[PDB]
Amino acid sequence: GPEMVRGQVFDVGPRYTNLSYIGEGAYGMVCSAYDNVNKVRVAIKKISPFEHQTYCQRTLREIKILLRFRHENIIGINDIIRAPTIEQMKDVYIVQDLMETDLYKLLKTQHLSNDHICYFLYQILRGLKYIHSANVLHRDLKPSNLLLNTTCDLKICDFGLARVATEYVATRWYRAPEIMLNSKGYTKSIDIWSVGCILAEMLSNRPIFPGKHYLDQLNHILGILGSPSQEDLNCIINLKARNYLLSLPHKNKVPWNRLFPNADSKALDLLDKMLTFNPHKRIEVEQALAHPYLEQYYDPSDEPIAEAPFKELDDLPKEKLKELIFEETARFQPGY
Template identity: 55%
Template structure:
């Protein structure tokens, strides 16, 4: 499996990539990798290359990487970032770093919000419409994104928007066992729905709608609406702005202590969105209020939001596609060890490089000697 490579440094990280990629500039870095922009000299296409160093050293992060690759390589939608390649290593044994190649965008919504760029109502409508259009597709595949925030919404110079970072995504099934649903949350709490913090009886697609509402408010006000310093402060901010939830709205809080705590808080009248966002239109504030509703059962759905008068100029039911099938989260049911996760990531490589299917991998079992815990899970080498 010989390949010609070239090396360069980006933000202190060494990139060893296929020789037809030429470095343009570093883009950024986070807890899960370093990203740089590059040009494919064969096609002329500009791409983003994300390097995840020692991808198998932390099982939680490995699973996050696998989840992201599985979803982004299968989803086909204009408002969802597309993976165009996963670079192949020289061999399975040397497979330690993961290089994900995706479409290159110019900026993200966080940078736009924090810039001096003037945003008209037309801009706001276009941003919110595209987020909802992409979210309709995501939800139709029975997927919860769970980490929608301005920095995960990429933009180009035409204001075209793409949703990225599906590392925290989960199956959208209220009956699913959501043990660990919150413990893996490492993202900012500012966009987190109240039902997640209050241990609701079930988690639904409404958690993503809440996040869109927070983003909507941040675009209008050019600052986060609920910048909680911790869990308690976050709840206080939400209730201070939305007002004290009714007894009916708190009935579905499963945790008795959390329910009692919310009901014990002093009464808050709530603040007027009109006073908070004096320059916003009535239609914008109406949609915002329907998104930022305390009870998930009363919160507007994505489909309803797309039909809202605020988005009437953009809404086209014939151009808001849905997924052809539900995303398969079956691999999440097993507490997989590092060797199996590596094999599953190799399987994803095979979808981009069919010649790798000929590489023989030693059969792997998910036994305790390999560092696994919990149920055993079979590794399917189906590369469809």
């Protein structure tokens, strides 16, 4: 019958065999496998989203975007397996290139040198430059979706929340303050904040803004950035959120070099421009790439961009979204 892993059906044979559990997100279970047709190792993510409108959104968005992106620092989709009829389709298997680990797992075991922080940071921004050039926001960057192979190549993954320029997630320590405040008008700078948070974690092997909920999270951010300036306050669109922040006790800014006393000063300069409360003043991806911290790797001629930008699913019921997912995956079926 179907192949099985940890008591879960992984029906991807006969082409894909030798499944080995890797890990699990909040939505997908991921295995390595062997592709007997191309004679290569792959990863396969199983998702079962059709009972939940929000899971269907995640699935459709990830498939749609990843199939149009092609970049060394972004995971590609090789193949997609699902049932030959929509009525039988309950699971979707997304076949991707196999990576060895992710930044979350690496940081649990290793303290990175500065040269490795620069390289990983550069690869993040190089992928993000292409993403943002397509007018796409990733919106959920975090260490666990920064995949790594043995050659230390880095590929961004997990585009279920991506959108052209929310919902429950397993972590929001990497979310920009405006996400927790304004609740609308999200820009490319929200990704830059997330990258700033990842840079900080690579510098200390600890998350910079942990917190049990949004309120606690904002207190962590404010406890380091200090109370928002007048100009900062004006860039908050929702007046009730602005009044909330006005209600909090005053907080002084903690100098970055007190938090990271041994870090390279160039790294902290870039971190400061990334973890800027005001999204309009936050450094942009191409400016970050050209920052002196990254001069060993910066090479605009080898930092490609998308040919052209992309240019809604919240209203669609889950039955409509399942039709759309069936349609989007037909190109991997025989007889399309």
